[PDB]
Structure 1
Amino acid sequence: KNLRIMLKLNPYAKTMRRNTILRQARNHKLRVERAAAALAAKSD
């Protein structure tokens, strides 16, 4: 629960956590792209 104690013990968890946040904002942007390309597939 403490970011900088996790970086005091495991300095890699900083990039392990910057990933899976970028990767997640981009997978949620891919999903909202599919799901907003299909609202034009049942409208066209």
Structure 2
Amino acid sequence: KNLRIMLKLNPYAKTMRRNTILRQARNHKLRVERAAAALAAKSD
């Protein structure tokens, strides 16, 4: 639950938890722009 203990034992967990956030927030924009690129391909 805590962070600045995990950093105290293992400081790389910083740059392993900064990732898996900018991926789990970059795929959601590349997903909604799918459902949009395809809902304008549905009215056709």
Partner SS, residue 26 of structure 2: helix
TM-score by length of 1: 0.88
Distance 1:31 1:24 in 2: 11
Segments of structure 2 that go 5 or more residues without pairing to the other structure are none
Distance 2:38 2:25 in 1: 20
Distance 1:43 1:4 in 2: 52
TM-score by length of 2: 0.88
4+ runs deviating over 2 angstroms: none
RMSD value over aligned CA atoms? 0.8
The aligned length equals 44
